[PDB]
Q: What sequence folds into this?
RNA sequence: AAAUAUGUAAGAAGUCCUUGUUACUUAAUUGAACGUGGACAUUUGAAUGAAGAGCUUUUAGUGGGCCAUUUUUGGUAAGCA
RNA sequence: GAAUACUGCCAGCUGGGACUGAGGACUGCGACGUAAGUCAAGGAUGCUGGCAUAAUGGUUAUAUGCCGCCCGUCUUGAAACACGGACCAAGGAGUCUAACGUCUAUGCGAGUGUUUGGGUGUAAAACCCAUACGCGUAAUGAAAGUGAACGUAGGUUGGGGC
């Protein structure tokens, strides 16, 4: 009766209920994702059948990566990059797409490559390079208890809860994204695909909105 | 030599508007200014007394004093690496109420009324403004709107 | 390379220890370091930081100031705490029975407090009696009453004392100080 | 950007309360990817109507595959391009098996013969020539004769090794 | 002491996300889609084939 | 002999290294430039308010 | 009559209700300024960030500048001014 | 009616190569297990061989590959066709003092300062001391002069701690 196993069994039981909760929430997220994607697919098909065109809802999330070094930057784009927390090359963050942030993206276009990230990209990014800002420190997530301790007051109890709040831009996206430390990506493993980076993606360069190819770029950078 | 008189470089800024010369209409003098009111400064060139210096044209400040024919305005002026408080005695011909602050005051009233109705029904009435959101999905119908195909046009001289 | 938004390697700018070499002050600091780590009372942290301050940042606290503090409602039975010196004051003629914890008591202050039926005690006695600062009242002396502060911020129309050795007529009371001699400030 | 695909891009002005259902303008755009295709769409819509990307919306973008991508076709192309000293209109004929491959050949040929970069070329029209006697350029006409056959004199064989032991031949 | 990558090291991958075993057991990464025989409208076909 | 006459070069960088700071407003601003009649009467108004509050609080 | 650049606001030092002070003001128990009481978390009133924020004292060196894009003056021009 | 390309996804499987092995009782999160337990799960272990010394390694000379202009100084700009410097040893330049500012340490504290002097001494030391004097405890005015509580030494806003 030394209270070792008496408290360890209680802690193990509490961990069991936490994992049961996480399991059910992740399953519900998986059905929600599948239903969403299948629903847009069938919406396009049904609009075709009816003779209409289905215009997809505009994207709510962008991933932005700084692709330019820190020297010789004008003050306004330098300030915007600091406010987006892109203070070194190959740093990346998520941005919720509104008019206010779209004007920032326009203002830093020659120094970043951005686009609309897919669920695979977000999941791999947070699983590989996810770090929490806890007490001003860069803390590797590596466990669901850390996320519960710093984000559980918003209902985020797991790394999949965090990913869900990112992918569907939820009510507490600001807090979840700010909790995420800016991602430190590497140079792309097969290169940039272009001779010269510092033209617009449209003109055969790297910067600007490359909307759906940001997934390929980030996978190579991750 | 150089010249830096009080009204130097004001040739166009102190003009009267085109076909808007002469007597100032009485709405300027019928206005009521209280301490704490936020006002814009725009000099009227036909009233040479109580006139602001050219730096304050377009500046917006707070009334701190009310006299017989003038108001005192606080203005923040950037000098060197900091801001300094400047007190201006301006005749009412050179100022006007800030419409921005007017609309903020009715926005405050609307916020109170929304909260009062939400106390009855519909809690969490979303009082904060939001930026323009990305648009949602939509069905565009071709019925009576068959797409017209455009192409670039060849070059012509026009002369 | 990283676009630094703030100065790197910036020291916090606060004393983490007394600059003095007093072994007894260091023992007091050891006690309140332990107390501020192992208790959640903000009083212990306040006392620990006050033990670091310099002489000008611990102005003397008079017994008149102590009596005025004990005049506050509900403060009659509180333990007065002065991280510094308690000095004597002959302007005041009556004292209540009270307990004062301080670094130092002047002979006059100690005699007056003891004569009033009170007791003078060191900060470790305070730590033993009130480990969480129970029922205490921290008093601090006037910092800007120092003579050096008279001259801080000297400038035209600022109304500060000029740094001057001799005082009187013929010593900086002329041109610059009155309208009849040039201008006034 | 000469991994060319063809897209139909349909867009419109944003619906308003006074004017719902705008007129749904459509373009055929040759481009390497959908992002460039939408960029070209807004570029041409800005240049022909009073509609910029901010006041409009892309309703549909679809890749158009060649209907018979494995039959040799004669293509007539109308272009306008900018030279160093003016703008010009041009007509060319390309014999090839698909529209995208004809347009790739067109861009390479305009770069080679007129130093005309992609920036400087508007493809006015690409249309299959239905029948012969409408082809007007001899470099396409000469490949349309009966029982065509020609040799390829002077064959040059690639050598994988630095030294050969045989003093090779060019027969073919 | 060491960050261990999920997406490899199945042990850490399953310490996080207990649902991963159910995902890999039901083969949710290769979900067969239902069959639908929806046909685009003729007007869509002519619009696409235009010019 | 001759040197540079003037330039504002680097001056904005200097001004922004220690930032451009706002005047740090307060509650109860100073009654400087306020009309003397106003503040003369305001003194008596505050005095009466304090006296009435003291009487009400006994 | 642009583009770029630029002032201000986006709330608790607030809003509302009631009634207290004055020697100012009102024809007036009209106002003005400052208040006593009372009612106001999911969002305390747009976004993003915040690296701690605010404040003080004291003192070094410097007070020959020059170059690039863009705007621009004199000059034919200049690695000119 | 199908295939295939292209694009995308898999918490699909699997082979080859390189660099790294930080930490040092246990504690955590998990996984496989009916359990006992085991594990790739909060950082390398197991098995084997040769040598046990110039073998590895250090130092040094040389060779090879690539790179490397002469320092100091004034200056926007120095390798400069700018100035000083052939070489070496020894010497060679922010000191002391009077009066001060800020900061800090110390003693005492409405006071403070023994050392002009006197007393004393193991004799330029140490130890002890009266009356004064300096600064501080009151300011202001040119000066004659006058000289700091209406009040719980005031009201209001904020304010650590209690």
A:
């Amino acid at each position: 009766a030394e209270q070792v196993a008496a408290e360890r069994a209680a802690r193990k039981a509490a961990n069991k209920e936490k994992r049961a909760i996480i399991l059910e929430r992740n399953a519900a997220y998986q059905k929600e994702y599948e239903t969403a994607e299948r629903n847009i697919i069938q919406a396009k098909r049904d609009a075709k059948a009816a003779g209409s065109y289905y215009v997809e809802a505009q994207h709510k999330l962008v991933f932005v990566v700084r692709i330019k070094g820190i020297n010789k930057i004008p003050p306004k784009p330098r300030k915007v990059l600091q406010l987006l927390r892109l203070t070194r090359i190959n740093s990346g963050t998520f941005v919720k797409v509104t008019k206010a942030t779209l004007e920032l993206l326009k203002l830093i276009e020659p120094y970043v490559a951005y686009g609309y990230p897919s669920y695979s990209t977000i999941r791999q990014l947070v699983y590989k390079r996810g770090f929490g800002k806890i007490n001003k420190q860069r803390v590797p997530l590596s466990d669901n208890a850390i996320i519960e301790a710093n984000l559980g007051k918003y209902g985020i109890l797991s790394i999949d809860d965090l990913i869900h709040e990112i992918i569907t831009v939820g009510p507490h996206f600001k807090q979840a994204n700010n909790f995420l430390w800016p991602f430190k990506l590497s140079n792309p493993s097969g290169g940039w695909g272009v001779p010269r980076k510092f033209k617009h993606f449209i003109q055969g360069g790297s910067f600007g909105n490359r909307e759906e190819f940001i997934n390929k770029l980030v996978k190579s950078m991750n | 030599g150089k010249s830096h008189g009080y009204r130097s470089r004001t040739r166009y800024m102190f003009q009267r508007d085109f076909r808007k010369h002469g007597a100032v209409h009485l709405s300027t003098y019928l206005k009521v200014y209280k301490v704490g009111d936020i006002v814009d400064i725009k000099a009227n060139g036909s009233i040479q007394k109580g006139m602001p210096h050219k730096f304050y044209q377009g500046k917006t400040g707070v009334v701190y004093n009310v006299t017989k024919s003038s108001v005192g305005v606080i203005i923040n002026k950037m000098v060197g690496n900091r801001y300094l408080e400047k007190r201006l005695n301006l005749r009412v011909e050179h100022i006007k109420h800030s419409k921005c602050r007017q609309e903020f005051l009715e926005r405050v009233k609307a916020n109170a009324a929304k909260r009062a109705e939400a106390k009855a029904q519909g809690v969490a009435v979303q009082l904060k403004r939001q930026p323009a959101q990305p648009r949602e999905s939509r069905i565009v119908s071709t019925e009576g709107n068959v797409p017209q195909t455009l192409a670039p046009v060849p070059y012509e001289t026009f002369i | 390379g990283i676009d630094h938004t703030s100065k790197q390697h910036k020291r916090s700018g606060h004393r983490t220890a007394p600059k003095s070499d007093n072994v007894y002050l260091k023992l007091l600091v050891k006690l309140y370091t332990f107390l501020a780590r192992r208790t959640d009372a903000p009083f212990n942290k306040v006392v620990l930081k006050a033990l670091f301050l310099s002489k000008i940042n611990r102005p003397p606290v008079s017994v008149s100031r102590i009596a005025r503090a004990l005049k506050q409602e509900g403060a009659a039975n509180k333990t007065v705490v002065v991280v510094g010196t308690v000095t004597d004051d002959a302007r005041i003629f009556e004292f209540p029975k009270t307990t004062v914890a301080a670094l130092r008591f002047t002979a006059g202050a100690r005699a007056k407090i003891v004569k009033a039926g009170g007791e003078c005690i060191t900060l470790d006695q305070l730590a033993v009696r009130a480990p969480k600062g129970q029922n205490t009242l921290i008093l601090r002396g006037p910092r800007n009453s120092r003579e050096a502060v008279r001259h801080f911020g000297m400038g035209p129309h600022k109304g500060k004392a000029p740094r001057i050795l001799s005082t009187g007529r013929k010593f900086e009371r002329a041109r610059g100080r009155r309208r009849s001699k040039g201008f006034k400030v | 950007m000469a991994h060319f695909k063809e897209y139909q891009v349909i867009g419109r002005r944003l619906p308003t309360e006074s004017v719902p259902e705008p007129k749904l303008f459509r373009m055929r755009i040759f481009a390497s990817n959908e992002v460039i295709a939408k960029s070209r769409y807004w570029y041409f819509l800005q240049k022909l109507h009073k509609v910029k990307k901010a006041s409009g919306e892309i309703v549909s973008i679809n890749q158009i595959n060649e209907a018979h991508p494995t039959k040799v076709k004669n293509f007539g192309v109308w272009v306008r391009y900018d030279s160093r000293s003016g703008t010009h209109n041009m007509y060319k004929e390309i014999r090839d098996v698909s529209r995208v491959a004809a347009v790739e050949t067109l861009y390479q040929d305009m770069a080679a013969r007129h130093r005309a970069r992609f920036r400087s070329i508007h493809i006015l029209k690409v249309a299959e020539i239905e029948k012969t006697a409408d082809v007007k350029r001899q470099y396409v006409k000469q490949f349309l004769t009966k029982d065509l056959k020609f040799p390829l004199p002077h064959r040059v064989q690639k050598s994988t090794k630095t030294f050969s032991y045989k003093r090779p031949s060019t027969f073919y | 002491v060491l960050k261990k990558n999920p997406l490899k090291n199945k042990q850490v991958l399953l310490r996080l996300n207990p649902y991963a075993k159910v995902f890999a057991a039901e083969k949710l990464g290769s979900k067969k889609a239902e069959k639908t025989g929806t046909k685009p409208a003729a007007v869509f076909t002519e619009t696409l084939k235009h010019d | 002999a001759k040197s540079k006459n003037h330039t504002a070069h680097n001056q904005t960088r200097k001004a922004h290294r220690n930032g451009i700071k706002k005047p740090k407003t307060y509650k109860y601003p100073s009654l400087k430039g306020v009309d003397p009649k106003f503040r003369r009467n305001h003194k008596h108004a505050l005095h009466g308010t304090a006296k009435a509050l003291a009487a009400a609080k006994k």
Chain E is about 40% helix and 0% strand.
